[PDB]
Amino acid sequence: EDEDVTFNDISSLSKHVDEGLDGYRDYLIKYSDRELVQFFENAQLKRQYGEETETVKRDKDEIEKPSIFALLPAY
Amino acid sequence: AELDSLLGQEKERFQVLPGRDKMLYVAAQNERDTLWARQVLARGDYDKNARVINENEENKRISIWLDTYYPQLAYYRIHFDEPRKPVFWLSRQRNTMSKKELEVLSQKLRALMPYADSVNITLMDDVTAAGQAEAGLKQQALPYSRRNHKGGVTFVIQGALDDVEILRARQFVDSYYRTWGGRYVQFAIELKDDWLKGRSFQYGAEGYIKMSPGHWYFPS
Amino acid sequence: AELDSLLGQEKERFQVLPGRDKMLYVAAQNERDTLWARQVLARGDYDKNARVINENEENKRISIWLDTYYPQLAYYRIHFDEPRKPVFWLSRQRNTMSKKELEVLSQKLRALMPYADSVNITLMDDVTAAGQAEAGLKQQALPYSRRNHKGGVTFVIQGALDDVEILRARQFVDSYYRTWGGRYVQFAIELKDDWLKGRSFQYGAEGYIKMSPGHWYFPSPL
Amino acid sequence: DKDLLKGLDQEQANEVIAVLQMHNIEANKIDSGKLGYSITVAEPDFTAAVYWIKTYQLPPRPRVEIAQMFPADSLVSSPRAEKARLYSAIEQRLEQSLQTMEGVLSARVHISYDIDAGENGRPPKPVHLSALAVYERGSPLAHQISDIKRFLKNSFADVDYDNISVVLSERSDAQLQAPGTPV
Amino acid sequence: DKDLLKGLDQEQANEVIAVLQMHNIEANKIDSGKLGYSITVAEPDFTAAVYWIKTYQLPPRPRVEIAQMFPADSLVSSPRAEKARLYSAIEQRLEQSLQTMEGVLSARVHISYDIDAGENGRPPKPVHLSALAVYERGSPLAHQISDIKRFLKNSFADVDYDNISVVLSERSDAQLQAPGTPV
Amino acid sequence: DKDLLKGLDQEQANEVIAVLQMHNIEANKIDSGKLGYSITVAEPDFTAAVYWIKTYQLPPRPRVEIAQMFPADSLVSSPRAEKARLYSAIEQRLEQSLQTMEGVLSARVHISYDIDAGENGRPPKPVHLSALAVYERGSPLAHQISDIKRFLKNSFADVDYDNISVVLSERSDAQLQAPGTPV
Amino acid sequence: DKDLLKGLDQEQANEVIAVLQMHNIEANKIDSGKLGYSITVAEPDFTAAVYWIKTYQLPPRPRVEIAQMFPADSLVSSPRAEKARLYSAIEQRLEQSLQTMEGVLSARVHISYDIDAGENGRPPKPVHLSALAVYERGSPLAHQISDIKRFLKNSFADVDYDNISVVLSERSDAQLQAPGTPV
């Protein structure tokens, strides 16, 4: 409920809505295991993948942004 | 049993002088040695009169006497490298005295020191003193500020000094003070916290510090 | 029982000189040897008067006396390679004295050193000293800054130094100090969390420009 | 002769004798076995010896190490105790290493204990270190601080030269000549 | 002779003797073994000795240390008690380290016990320190405070020079000559 | 002769004798079997011997190793203890390996025990290493630091030349001539 | 004759004798059976023998192997212990194999112990190896490093030539002539 925002595109809106949930995301990250979270984060994708390398994204984004469906059962 | 035979094997560690008051004066170089000597007398091993003396104690006693009879005399320190003929350094600018007055002063000092045959008065330059202080601070590459007052100079050394700096400064200050004393030039060492580490800031005429995004601090 | 017979089997380690004050002076090379000798005397194995001396102690003592009677004399060091004829190095540019004054100075030094027959005074060049200092730094390829003052030169070596650099630096400095002393040229070695090793630059529309020297340094984010 | 102290340990007796000798007081050490050591002095020196024993608070208390407070013989231990023992053993092993450097006579080292944190869901603070050391006479202290800092920096996962304090001092003059006997 | 005190410990007796000698009172120490030491004086000095024993509140109490309130021989330790023992051992180790600095004769250190709360739920507060020390005569106290502050700053995770208090004092005059015996 | 110390171990005794001989003090070692070794000196040398024993804090402490805080005799083990024992055994095996290099007389090595965090959840940190060594006279120290660094780098999963500190020193002058006997 | 050391074992005794003979000190080994071996020297050589015993830190304490911390003979074992024993056996078997190559007199090998993490869930990390070896005089060291690297590379599932460090040295001059007996 914040009347000063403005958007231009589906991406710019997605980002702002995701940013809204970080308050909850942080709580789940605090109280759950990093490695089980990472395992499910792999399992959502890697049935797609032709490759073994995981470094391909440097951690600083993905460590902050595990998905909520990955966080829930791990919590 | 002479006194020299009672002070130890290291004969030259101590120096015995006769005083006109019929008393022996033992000259020592430091506190530890002073107490090594004083124990012998306080035990009462020797039957005649004797006394133990050192340069810092004598400087203090003489300054206390000057405080009473010459409360406006400007001077530095008295050197006792040759205990029979001390050297007294006076300021050339901050005093005016005639030769007669200087002689009278000389004789009264000689009366205070019954072990000295004469006192040599030498006039020293304040500009020289101040210059040797500043040159030494520069040679040591310490950061400093200089303040001038009518009767003295003050060097302030303040900030987040390092261990190597603290050590160098301490050594230097202690070297200077043993030559010139602490009457004309004073040094002040002041450790304080660092505000800039990890903060963005603007410096120059209009400086300020970013405490955090959205918070501006303006210093005086 | 002469003193030489009491100091040991390694006769060559020590040198015994007769002093004009009726006292034996034992010349040593280092602290460990100095204490090896002093134990003999302090135990009281020898009955006559004797004293132990070394070059660093004597340099200190003589400088303390100069501080009182010649408070403005510019000088480097007194060498005792041949203890009967020491060599005293004076600056040429910073002193100004006549031959008579030099002779008087010579005689007063001789009066302070009852084991020396004469003192030779030699004039040395400051530019030479400073040049040898900088040449040795470049020869080691140490990173450094030079600062000049009326009375002296200061070389600063600071930042994230490496083990090999630290070793070379300490060795060089310790070699130089033994020749020229620490009166004219100073070396300051300080470790800082600074990858540039004291260089500093500011960025602007034309590119980088070098900063001036200063106390402030930017800790390396890397 | 008057009795100053009784029932001393070996190291205590030797420290007391050293301090009395420094001030020109001739003292005697006697061994009674199960009863320990006794120290005695002459009457002319009794007063002074009392004043120095007061001023230095002799005999010395025993040396304190943090592992003493969490005896390992316990049937139960928290993580806090284990972590404490660990740090209190690293401090000792570093002082034992520093004493082997060239010219060092002794050293003492302190580490920032942060084991008082539970570290629950919480980032670890950086480590801080302090050291004292004594050198042989004629050592360039200024040039020797660098070596110590360099050596300490890499002994821990995260230490900055800014966070290391080092204080050095030289050995005092040697006490070689014996004190004089009262007449 | 009149009896002043009985059943003293050795370190209590020497403190009493030292304080009486300073005021020119000749005292005698006697040993009864399992019964301890006894102190006696002459009648002309009895009055003065009584008044000084009152004024200084001799004999001295035993030394207090916080670890005595939370002895490790207990079946359960709270997170409060363990943390307290820890701090109470660090205090003593710092005092013993400062006593090794050049010129220092004795010292004391105090640390802020935040453990008087668990620090449950709330985050921890910053640490505060205080120290006292005695120096040998002729020491530049002003220039020596810096070293102490520098050394203490790095022994803890978060300390500011503003939060460190240091108080220094010099040794009093030496009591070397013996008191005169009553006529 | 005056007694300096009693009940020494063999390795304590030989270190004391070495330190006295270096300062020209002739000492004697006596064996009492179950009572250990005793050290004695002449009166003219007693004072000096006392001063040196104080200055060097003799007799030496026994050598610490971290495995001593977590005995394998423990009734139970946590992961922290096992990991500690592991690291404390690797340090010793590396020192024993370095002594086999050409010219090295002795060395000491230290490791980052990051185990103090049991790595519950948190990822591991990289290792840091420190080493000291003593060389035979006439060794090009500058050229020999490289070999040590090269050797240590590959002993661990992740180490950078930047994270390895090495300090080297030469052997002191040899003590070959015997001390003089008091007259 | 003066006693240097008592209660030695066979390997410590032969090590001391070797070191003393190298410096021209004639020594004697005596066997007391259940009491072990004793080493003795003449008085003129006592001082030197003491100085070398200190400088080399003799006698040598015995060789450390990582399996000694997690002794296989136990009622219980855990994955960390099993994995540790495994690696500590491969290390020893490789050193024993290298000593069979042509010219090698002795060698030592080290492996990166990744077991200090469980490697459960966390992905396992690649191996690093280090080797030291001593050769007979007149060996082309440069040409022989290649063989060692080639041999070591294939002993593990994933090793890169970049991750293998090898340091080689030659045997010192032979000590064949006997030392001279004091006159």
From Swiss-Prot, chain A:
Intracellular or extracellular location(s): Cell membrane
First and last residues shown, out of full length: 76 to 150 of 224
Function: Involved in a secretory pathway responsible for the surface presentation of determinants needed for the entry of Salmonella species into mammalian cells.
Family: Belongs to the FliP/MopC/SpaP family.
Provenance organism: Salmonella typhimurium (strain LT2 / SGSC1412 / ATCC 700720)
Name under which the protein is recorded: Surface presentation of antigens protein SpaP
Curated annotation (Swiss-Prot), chain B:
Main location: membrane
Keywords, sorted A to Z: Cell membrane, Membrane, Transmembrane, Transmembrane helix, Virulence
Membrane topology per record: Single-pass membrane protein
UniProt-annotated location(s): Cell membrane
CC terms in the record's Gene Ontology section: plasma membrane
Role according to the record: Required for invasion of epithelial cells.
Name this polypeptide is given: Protein PrgH
Gene: prgH
Full-sequence portion shown in this chain: 171 to 390 of 392
From Swiss-Prot, chains D, E, F, G:
Keywords attached to this entry: Cell outer membrane, Lipoprotein, Membrane, Palmitate, Protein transport, Signal, Transmembrane, Transmembrane helix, Transport, Virulence
Domain of life: Bacteria
Compartment(s) of residence: Cell outer membrane
Membrane topology annotation: Lipid-anchor
The keyword Magnesium is annotated on this UniProt entry: no
Biological process terms in GO annotation: protein secretion
A GO-annotated cellular component: cell outer membrane
Job description of the protein: Required for invasion of epithelial cells. Could be involved in protein secretion.
Similarity-based family: Belongs to the YscJ lipoprotein family.
Protein's recorded name: Lipoprotein PrgK
Source lineage: Bacteria, Pseudomonadati, Pseudomonadota, Gammaproteobacteria, Enterobacterales
